[PDB]
Design a binder for this molecule. Structure first.
Ligand SMILES: O=P(O)(O)C(Nc1cncc(-c2ccc(OC3CC3)cc2)c1)P(=O)(O)O
Ligand SMILES: O=P(O)(O)C(Nc1cncc(-c2ccc(OC3CC3)cc2)c1)P(=O)(O)O
Lengths: 338, 338
């Protein structure tokens, strides 16, 4: 509810984000209208967890007497920058994976009269981050630190995307689905921008700019990010859609935690069943896969992993949170846990 | 030849650009190999005019006693950053336009086993700019100015791309091909990153960071950029491939200077011929278009435009070059003129 409290004013701020990004240069009006449409379609409709973490962390990291009106405008804005980063990645990712829907809406690129123009639209969303940072934060001591953090985050995510694309050519081979490779993908592709970025942005805005402090936060948050993606992979199969969307990882030939662990623990005659069934449109095949996972006690393996993980994270928060308040980590953990 | 003199050491520096961008983190090796391939395929093979302008301008803007070894490493590097910016735009543009070749080579996205993964590859090329700037320029006083210049340049180009895409839906309507719209596209899509960016980067590296100075340079260079794109449109039709590639603007339904001027100067019965012929795969139609341009004395209109343009540019260089040496502009002009 620390998140539920901030959410009202966060989403309300979006209206202003859009105003300023379309606010002189009359010749480009039509392009700016297109920009407006891209923002409204792509940046709105999710949970906004990543953005909100910026604002919640800011509240927990700054003396309450130094949380003036301006400071809060800036914290909302950087939060919206995180959401724009995410929109950039997802618009582009949806093209690369030939996805149909995102958030139960037709993917932007699939809207008629959009198509591959969405590539430029994604790029504009990335541009908007640095426009906002300039408009709201150029005079601040942390300005350069945020620019570099956003850029570093894009690069990390892109490297991760490269690994994903090398790992599952859309021509998939299960020999490539290893744990070391699974961990790298999650780390570079999701954990950095999802878990490290928002807290880091908040750290910098509160004057916490030390390498060791950042290294400590990053150690905790990367492991949080690892856990939560593995949790998403599991829920994709063994969840209920009410609890979670509907799961399609198997028919999609994904390098999912489930498949990875399956491969580690199998006699030679179980690879040559999974080969047979993994990635097929038909549903009798998708059931064979689930039933194999079930026969391999992968819930149990998950449960054991969930325990080791909770323990290790709490230990890390004990060691490395200081001098940040532990509730910064603990809150995010509680909030993402599904 | 001021360009021909710098070219040897510029292209040689590329080897180092690639070394440092693939130079600790063993888990991502395969992604870094992919990065190596993307750089070598996409950043190499052009004339390198934009990159080289950075180096040539640097030589003309800095006291020769302050052109130490390090300074030259940095000037080569920022030049290569300009070339990487261009690779980013062209890789992505080739996808959006469904292009086949670029520089008589198969477009990157058309290479088998690449496809729409090229979207991420383009993004990596953009990432590499800010990696290089950090590796070579983080300690310099102009560091932030360059970061912002590259980002501003991406945004401008992307806005321009949006206008192009709105102007010629790949569903083209000639009513949209206006001069005011033609000028905006060229300005935002090509002139800023091609003409303003490289000189500006050089200005900043030489300590010339004043708004008025930049405004003055930009006034000259944007008009240079306008002229040279209009020159490219003309040559596309009325050139010889030896002088120039082969021209395909007409069958491609392009908002080209030629078509634009055609529309301004036509009786109602000439729109309804151009409607008929513009954008058709067949070659008897493409000849009708050329013959119409010829009948409209568009060479003459070009010639008249070339004269007015040379005069105005020289006048601008007279007024606004100072305190930059006029040879900075004049050289670029001479070098780009085809
Ligand atoms: O509620 P669940 O059914 O999911 C139970 N799991 C549970 C109960 N209480 C705490 C956790 C927990 C919380 C956070 C965790 O990781 C985040 C700190 C990164 C990991 C596990 C997990 P279980 O699956 O063991 O029956
Ligand atoms: O050599 P060309 O045949 O192209 C001759 N043109 C020509 C001759 N001398 C100088 C120019 C000139 C150079 C630079 C120009 O613009 C650059 C400063 C931006 C414009 C025109 C153009 P023309 O077409 O008039 O017979």
């Amino acid at each position: 509810d620390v998140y539920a409290q901030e959410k009202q004013d966060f989403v309300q701020h979006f209206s202003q984000i859009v105003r300023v990004l379309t606010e002189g240069h009359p010749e480009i009006g039509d392009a700016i209208a297109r920009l407006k449409e891209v923002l409204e379609y792509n940046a709105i409709g999710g949970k906004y967890n990543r953005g909100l973490t910026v604002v919640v962390a800011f509240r927990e990291l700054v003396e309450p007497r130094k949380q003036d009106a301006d400071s809060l405008q800036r914290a909302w804005t950087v939060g919206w920058c995180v959401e724009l980063l995410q929109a950039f990645f997802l618009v582009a990712d949806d093209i690369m994976d030939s996805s149909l829907t995102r958030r139960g809406q037709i993917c932007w690129y699939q809207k008629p009269g959009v198509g591959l123009d969405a590539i430029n639209d994604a790029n504009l969303l990335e541009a908007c981050i640095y426009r906002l940072l300039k408009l709201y934060c150029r005079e601040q001591p942390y300005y350069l630190n945020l620019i570099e953090l956003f850029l570093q985050s894009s690069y990390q995510t892109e490297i991760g995307q490269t690994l994903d694309l090398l790992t599952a050519p859309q021509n998939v081979d299960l020999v490539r689905f290893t744990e070391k490779r699974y961990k790298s993908i999650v780390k570079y592709k999701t954990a950095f921008y999802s878990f490290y970025l928002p807290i880091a942005a908040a750290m910098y805005m509160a004057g916490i700019d030390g390498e060791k402090e950042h290294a400590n936060a990053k150690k905790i948050l990367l492991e949080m990010g690892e856990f939560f993606q593995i949790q998403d992979d599991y829920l994709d199969l063994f969840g209920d859609p009410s609890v979670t969307k509907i799961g399609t990882d198997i028919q999609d030939n994904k390098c999912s935690w489930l498949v990875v662990q399956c491969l580690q623990r199998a006699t030679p005659e179980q690879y040559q069943i999974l080969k047979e069934n993994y990635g097929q449109k038909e549903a009798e095949k998708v059931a064979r896969v689930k039933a194999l996972y079930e026969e391999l006690d992968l819930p149990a393996v998950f449960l054991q992993y969930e325990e080791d993980s909770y323990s290790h994270i709490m230990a890390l928060i004990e060691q490395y949170a200081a001098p940040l308040p532990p509730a910064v980590f603990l809150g995010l953990a509680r909030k993402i846990y599904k």
